[PDB]
Design a binder for this molecule. Sequence first.
Ligand SMILES: [Zn+2]
Ligand SMILES: [Zn+2]
Ligand SMILES: [Zn+2]
Ligand SMILES: [Zn+2]
Ligand SMILES: [Zn+2]
Ligand SMILES: [Zn+2]
Ligand SMILES: [Zn+2]
Ligand SMILES: [Zn+2]
Lengths: 239, 239, 239, 239, 239, 239, 239, 239
Amino acid sequence: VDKSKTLTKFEEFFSLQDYKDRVFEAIEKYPNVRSIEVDYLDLEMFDPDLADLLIEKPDDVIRAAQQAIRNIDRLRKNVDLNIRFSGISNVIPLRELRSKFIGKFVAVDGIVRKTDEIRPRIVKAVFECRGCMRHHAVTQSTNMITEPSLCSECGGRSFRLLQDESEFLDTQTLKLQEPLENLSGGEQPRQITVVLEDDLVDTLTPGDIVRVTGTLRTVRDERTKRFKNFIYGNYTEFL
Amino acid sequence: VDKSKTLTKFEEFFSLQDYKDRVFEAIEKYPNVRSIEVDYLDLEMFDPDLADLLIEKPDDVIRAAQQAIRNIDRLRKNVDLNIRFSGISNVIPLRELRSKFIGKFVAVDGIVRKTDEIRPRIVKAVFECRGCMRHHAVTQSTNMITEPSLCSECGGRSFRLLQDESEFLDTQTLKLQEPLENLSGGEQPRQITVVLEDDLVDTLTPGDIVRVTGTLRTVRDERTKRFKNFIYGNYTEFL
Amino acid sequence: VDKSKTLTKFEEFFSLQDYKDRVFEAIEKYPNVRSIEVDYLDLEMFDPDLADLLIEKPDDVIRAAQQAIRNIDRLRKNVDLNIRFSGISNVIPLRELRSKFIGKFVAVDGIVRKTDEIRPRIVKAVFECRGCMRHHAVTQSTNMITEPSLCSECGGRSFRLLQDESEFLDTQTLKLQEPLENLSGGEQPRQITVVLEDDLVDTLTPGDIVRVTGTLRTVRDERTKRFKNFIYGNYTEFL
Amino acid sequence: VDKSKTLTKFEEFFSLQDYKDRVFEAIEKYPNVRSIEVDYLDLEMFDPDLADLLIEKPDDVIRAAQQAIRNIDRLRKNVDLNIRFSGISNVIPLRELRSKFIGKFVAVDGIVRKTDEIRPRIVKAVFECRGCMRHHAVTQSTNMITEPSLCSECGGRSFRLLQDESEFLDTQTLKLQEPLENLSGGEQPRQITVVLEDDLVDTLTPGDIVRVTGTLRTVRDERTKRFKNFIYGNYTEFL
Amino acid sequence: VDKSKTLTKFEEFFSLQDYKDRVFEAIEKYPNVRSIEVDYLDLEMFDPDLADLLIEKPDDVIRAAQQAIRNIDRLRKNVDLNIRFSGISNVIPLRELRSKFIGKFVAVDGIVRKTDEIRPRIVKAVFECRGCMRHHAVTQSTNMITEPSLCSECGGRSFRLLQDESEFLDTQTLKLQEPLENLSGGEQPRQITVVLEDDLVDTLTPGDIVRVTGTLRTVRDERTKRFKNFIYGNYTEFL
Amino acid sequence: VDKSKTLTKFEEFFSLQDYKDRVFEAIEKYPNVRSIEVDYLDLEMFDPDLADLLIEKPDDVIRAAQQAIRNIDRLRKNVDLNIRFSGISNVIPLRELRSKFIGKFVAVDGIVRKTDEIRPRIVKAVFECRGCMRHHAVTQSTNMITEPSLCSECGGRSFRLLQDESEFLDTQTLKLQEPLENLSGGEQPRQITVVLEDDLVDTLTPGDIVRVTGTLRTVRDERTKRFKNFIYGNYTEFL
Amino acid sequence: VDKSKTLTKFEEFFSLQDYKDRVFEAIEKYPNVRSIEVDYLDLEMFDPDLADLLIEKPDDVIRAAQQAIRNIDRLRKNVDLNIRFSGISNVIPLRELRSKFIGKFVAVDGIVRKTDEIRPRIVKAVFECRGCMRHHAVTQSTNMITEPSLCSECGGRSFRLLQDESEFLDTQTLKLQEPLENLSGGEQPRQITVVLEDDLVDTLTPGDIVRVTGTLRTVRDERTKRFKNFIYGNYTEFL
Amino acid sequence: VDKSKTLTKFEEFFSLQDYKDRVFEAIEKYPNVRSIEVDYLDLEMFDPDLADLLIEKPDDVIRAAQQAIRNIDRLRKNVDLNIRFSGISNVIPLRELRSKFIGKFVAVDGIVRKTDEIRPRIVKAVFECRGCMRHHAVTQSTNMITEPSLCSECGGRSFRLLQDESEFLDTQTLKLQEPLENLSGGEQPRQITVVLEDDLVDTLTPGDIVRVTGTLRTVRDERTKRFKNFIYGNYTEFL
Ligand SMILES: [Zn+2]
Ligand SMILES: [Zn+2]
Ligand SMILES: [Zn+2]
Ligand SMILES: [Zn+2]
Ligand SMILES: [Zn+2]
Ligand SMILES: [Zn+2]
Ligand SMILES: [Zn+2]
Ligand SMILES: [Zn+2]
């Protein structure tokens, strides 16, 4: 919960002459950008402790980072930019994406195979509390709706989702096959699912040799009660 | 604006000479008409701000244009007329009907591919409150019944649908394929579902080159858990 | 609820010398008849307002009609005859049986195709109130049992169906294909389901060119949550 | 429940030339009369079986009697007259008013002692069902409110009394001391409570030698869980 | 024995010549009698074992002697007769009416001191089951209403007493003082309460030297929480 | 009439020249006035039917005269003014204030005997719904708080009174004795309670010969269970 | 009649010389017999009205004929004997076994086509009341367990079936095809299911030309929701 | 809720050279002072709008005032001083302390009569939520404990008071009799209760001619459901 300190670090970070500009000129083109790039190196340089936390707790850090930009933004109300990081020094071979990397910032190189259709998902679900009829919004991260814990106003524990009041976002999946030039006879290359959202959607194509950076997440499949790991894409570049 | 501010704006557009008569002739012919066509351009002339809301919140705006007409006719004959706008500048290509356009008024060109059977659907569902046995009517917009939030009379939260007291309405589904003259090799055209209801039913047929204007809606496919977009047709025109 | 007046109109109607007889001579052959025919014309003539209500609210009118016969019948206890109407001036083409005709008296011409097996259904379901163990009978119109709203004696809302105390009735379905001599190349004739009950059972045969008269009802199919219209047969004649 | 037959007997009874008049001329002076007198003898004569039932079930009979007058009264809506009987041949000594006479028509002679103040009571209590908020009226006979058994509309069993919607009536009590000219040395005369309502209120005075006619009722006193008998006055005359 | 074995034994005692007629004359005079006196000695002659149970379990025995008479009369006129035994050998002195005698048939001599007013009490309370609204009658033995255990029809456990449908019965209280000719200096006589009901009401008066025969019952005094013994009079005789 | 029909009638009486100004001057001086006196006679002139309702249903009528004034003032300053009628023909002698007059507008003469201390009472009670924590205000007319029927927002039925948010109002009690010049020997005058509130507080004193005009209300005395009548003062005048 | 009136009638038929011995010989051989055959004709002779009920309400009648025998045997050895009637005049052709015959005693001729495996079924299910843990036995007639309505001892409504304490019974299914000598071209014979239980098990085989006598029962086919008729065999005979 | 602005005004107010000192030198002697005096005039001068709000909403203002001092206090943790105001220009005669002054800052002159004993009360009650066992503190203002609305952590609505964890405060009451030198023959001077808490305790003595300043509060007495006004003392000075 001391991540409040992290917010501060980013607040300052987003004050350095160099960054302060790309931020503004980005908030300029809204909503034709949504993203602000960040060279991992500048972060490494300016405060190497934070640069480490990004790797251990991507989600939290990336949240605090976005929070800062919202604060240091007068004039243009709202505006939520996704901040993507480039040059992550934590490249990891596909085959090694096991449990230790669950929920960690990762960079994986490979070749894009199958690319699924682009479809929406709810990012901000709005619920109606069945206890007092009040409305509560809850940010979703998966395609599985997550109801509020309890209603703080009346103590209710039962909610009804109001789709017409919820906000959507574009989502897409693809297969990231590992590079062959490292295998050794007989071995049929392995692959992992990558999830691209918002503006990283419709960015990659079957064949693209790339380096996907992002958070390694996991999900248990229905029926086959087994988990499966996938990468929640943050930044992407060609090799 | 708020909804109320809009109703007014509309009550005047529907009072202007040019449309004053069209409205009465329709209210007159009911139910041999149901529709009342309005030129977008005229809406712009009368007001540029309203002609914009029509695109950002077509649902409420159109629901307002209906309460306006219902507030004009001399005989207060109720009459649920369909306001259909013609000539919409907001023309979006099919492949680009992503999330940003959910809930927005769009206009898409393409070619009617497959046409489905006309079936009815409940538009006004009547429920019996299991708490006090009173009756409540609730307007439905999808083919999925939506029960009332709670019974205002006794506080009940459980209802039973009374089909025999509900009002139906004809609905129809068809696939709209994108224009071929823009695809580039190895590219199979993408199609999208269009929903036609009331008097727009049985209006189009395979081959017809059209410019479907309507609200972009989304719906989660049962068992797949994935959302999919479709167009709720408002106005149709040939090219 | 003012249909009580309708009961009266039929009471009188079933007093005219002409009708008063076929009634009695019908109640004579019980239970080898069950039906009393009614020339729509005599109804049209004697009270043209009622003749109109039949079309708008078949079920209610036909109920009030049957109610009358029960009242104007001393001596032979019970005896419930179905009254069927001939010569309905509301003939409608098969293809046009849309929502406006849901719950309306209709006459449709066509050719009988597939004819299903004759099977029973419950017409009068008897329920045991789980609250006070009392018995309640409820008339069913579909093959889906409909429990009582609530128990008037104790306020119970939960019931158990007692099959052994319920009354059955013969039911049958068939397909009524539209007449071809009106189509126009390429068009594969459409069809609709007809439901024949009680003594209209085993009356039609594949091939019969007929004119089915009855109430247009609708039902949502399981799985495919879509509705489908069908005709609840009242009278039938050959062309 | 066959008391419906009793209603009939009174309907006829209140058709005899002689009575039919005092009824009308009474309904004339409303609301300056409220009472219609009935010579027990005429009742004895015309139908001696009814004349007996009055004695065994005063309340029911007197109800059916009042019901009749309401039926045989066109023109002046409402109007509820109390019918009082004179010349009851069931005179009983005060000291003998034991259990056998509970709920029986009785005539008792004595001298009026203490006379209490005149105060109102609720005759028709209106309740709000806490289940569905509907209103139910219930006739009260004592000064203790009696809630409905259950709500027939929703099955509710809990009610709230709405005083502002209830109707009141004047009530009064007095002591009827037994006649001394029948005692025998040492014996301190006994007494019983008489309850006078509506227009018999403020009719008797301490000292009046009278003959009270009415229904013998009983009530258990709080604290001292013992019952006590009293007379619910119907008719009164001086000796 | 069991209760049944006793009923039989009694059905014969009540069939013997000597008493055969007394029973019929009583059943005949009902309700101008209510009682049927039987000499204990005769009971001994007819059977010594039954004449004993009468003392060990007077309640059940007497309840049996009643079901017997009720099973003899020709007209099955019901008739709740009071069997009263005369000449009981089990004579216990007043001061010795302790616990061993609770529930036993005793006979105590003394002198009627103070006599209380005759009041009624419910003998047969009728309850309305709050579960199914059905009516249940329950015989009461004390002046404290005893609700049914549970409703056999619906399983309900909550009841409402319907006073207007309940049957009353006259009851009376008096103090019985021990015989003075046995006390020894500085000893104030001890008294005990006697309860007289039905036809035994208003039978004794101060001064009367009697030999009260009845069941010894006990009751806890409210607020004191202490039990106290009293005699439930069955038969009275002067000395 | 209905309530609405009355409001109108009043909105005009309060628009007439003669009273147009009195109303504004009062609305002006608020809250240094609160009252607005109106001559009954003038009400008769303006309308004889309304001047009658004032007597049959003073409560609603007066509640209407308030909504009228509240619907006239230019500044919509709310202002809860007290309409007080002067010169009421419906003068009833004290001893005759029985049930027929409960809820009616009366005028009684007598002499102020005893005067009680002025205390406040809640006029507008504010409750917190225990279901959703929302606040509801409810106008009180007695000194007994009356909770809301149910919460319309969530269906709750349980509330908690929030005294610190409720509005108070001064109330006062006094005994009004009947005029002595009409009693006839051995007759002690009868008194009745009068309740004075708002600006009528501390207006009368012992000895004052007055003509209290107000609504006759009744209330059950706790522990006694007996109703008692009292006058809710509207207008006072000296004789 | 009522059930009781019938039991008597039967107790006499089973007392007549001709059958007096058959019954005893059977009760004697139990359980090496179970059945007791009776000629319908004899039933007619003994009584024509009873021989009719047997057809209109075979279930109750047969249940009565069983309670009769159970009320005759000297040793009160219980013995659940099967009464099977021979030579039934009520012979109905297979294709005509519609609703009017549900619950009726019929006799149908045809040819045993397919025979199923003999399996057991619970005839007397024993349940443990989850409320008080008591045991209740309930006779089953179908292969679908039917729980008790409610527990009379404690009012419970929830039960658990105790298979190890329940009694089984052999049951068997076979298809009965209509006689071929009556069909007319292109007509494939219709078959109906027959259920054979107890000693009738493994009695018939393919090819056997028979005249199945039994009760016509109906049952709803799970998942189809459609009823289907079948014959519950009582007596079998070859042709 | 905009009282946050009031907090600010006091924050500034408590920064003026003059006040900033007495604050500090007061926080110096803790806990031997508890109070900081405030000349109403300085408040009147510096910001006359606030000086008015004090009178209308004493409680809120005085709260915001105390809140400020807590904020502008570094170094010495805790320390809650009561701020008392002197020289209130809202002196009001005792007899006029009616409803309009409920919850208003008031100054009343009079002579101290009876002085009650000093006793403690709970100022900060600590409750244990019966739902999750968590602890909640709630400031009390009366001697009647006020439980929390609901538990924000788990939604619980039931609490248990933990006396051993609650904080107490000294409280005292006295009678403030009005000054006689203003009455006029016969009039027996009136009085009102004053409540002195914390350090104003044991400050006044019978006889002291004083001017009590404070908030007028009201409370309904048990039994006698009537309210009574009293003064919650804030500042006191001698005349
Ligand atoms: Zn809530
Ligand atoms: Zn409801
Ligand atoms: Zn029930
Ligand atoms: Zn209700
Ligand atoms: Zn029950
Ligand atoms: Zn609420
Ligand atoms: Zn049980
Ligand atoms: Zn909690």
